[PDB]
Amino acid sequence: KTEQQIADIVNRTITPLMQEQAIPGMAVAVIYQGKPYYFTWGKADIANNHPVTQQTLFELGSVSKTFNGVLGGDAIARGEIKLSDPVTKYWPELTGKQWQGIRLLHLATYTAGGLPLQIPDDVRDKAALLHFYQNWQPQWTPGAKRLYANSSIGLFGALAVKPSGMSYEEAMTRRVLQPLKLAHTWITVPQNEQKDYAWGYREGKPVHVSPGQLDAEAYGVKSSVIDMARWVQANMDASHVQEKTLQQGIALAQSRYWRIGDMYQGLGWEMLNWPLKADSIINGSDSKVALAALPAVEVNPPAPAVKASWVHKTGSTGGFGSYVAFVPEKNLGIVMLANKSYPNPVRVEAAWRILEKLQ
């Protein structure tokens, strides 16, 4: 396929998507036979008429969890943690019986027993966060059910970097971002990059994600389409990542720790066997399913990364909707960055219709 053919497929899918969803600005990168092709439409800033560029920073939302999973897998490869470790090894103040059987594994894969989707917004400092976790009561035994939750994987990332002696952001920067040359990826956007920081739009107003407890670990990364293009290719094939633990941690985040219907829980990343029916991905992304508490079947030992997988993650904030998906077997992938939130089933639809024509 040529650049012309890729562009044609991309634009034929993106332009009506942006019209129907009323998305002001969009950036998309296609990974075709291992190489990136970039596309940009619309405005990053409506009132000030700043266009979207290949330097535009987008709020990744819960795609931030894939960096978490990779940073965590890095910590595993460095021997700093093991997912079988108890949470109290890393936060000993969580005394109290409900935390006794909970391991880093459960926090990482949302199987702790019902940690809630959001950390409550009235939990705004260190004292209240500890009190929140100390006093949370589970609905199931550890590892019974998967319930997707910021408070779960968010805490895993905050604890997994404790051996390193570094904060989450500094560990992330030093161990993942700088080694992969992601120089336009931020947990906090410095002042000299604010001009490239797109505005999300929620009900026609410009907005940026609000500070929250453990936001960095769960939904507070911002990145450009080129950095996310590099992200996808590094996770799809890290054979040329020169840091041995990072290349190993990339792979462990794609190990299959749990099977939940036809999907498998990695570390941040989620996987389905490839090839597959599109309705599986599309229907699975409806929040009626993805936010549901489902029975979790442990894969023990975790199955190593399967190259015939559809590997993906949705991510949203109040004003942004992102999606990343790739298929290692084909060296084929996509990233879709939008400064308006729109339905996950619609993101998956557009991704699949682009990637199905590039097989």
Give the total number of structural domains in the chain: 1
d(CA 301, CA 308): 19
Q: 161 and 131 in contact (C-beta within 8 Å)?
A: no
Strands 270-273 and 263-265: antiparallel
The domain of 78 spans 1-359
Q: Which of 62, 64, 151, 322 is catalytic?
A: 62
> What was the experiment behind these coordinates?
X-ray
- Paired tokens of 120: 């409550």
Measured from the Cβ of residue 303, the count of other Cβ atoms closer than 10 Å reads 14
Q: Indicate the Cα dihedral angle 232, 234, 238, 244, nearest 10°.
A: -140
Round to whole Å and give the CA distance between 334 and 29: 6
Q: Give all strands (DSSP E) within 83-162, no chain letters.
A: 145-146
Active-site residue flag, 62? yes
String of b and e for 130-160 (b: at least 16 CB within 10 Å)?
Answer: eebbeebebebebbbbbbbbbbbbbbbbbbb
- Residue with structure tokens 């939990």? 123
Q: What is the C-alpha separation between 92 and 90, in angstroms, rounded? A: 6
Beta-carbon count within 10 A of 88 CB: 15
Distance CA 122, CA 120 (A): 5
Contact of 112 with 102, CB cutoff 8 Å: yes
> This structure's resolution (angstroms)?
1.9
Question: How many CB atoms are closer than 10 A to CB 357?
Answer: 15
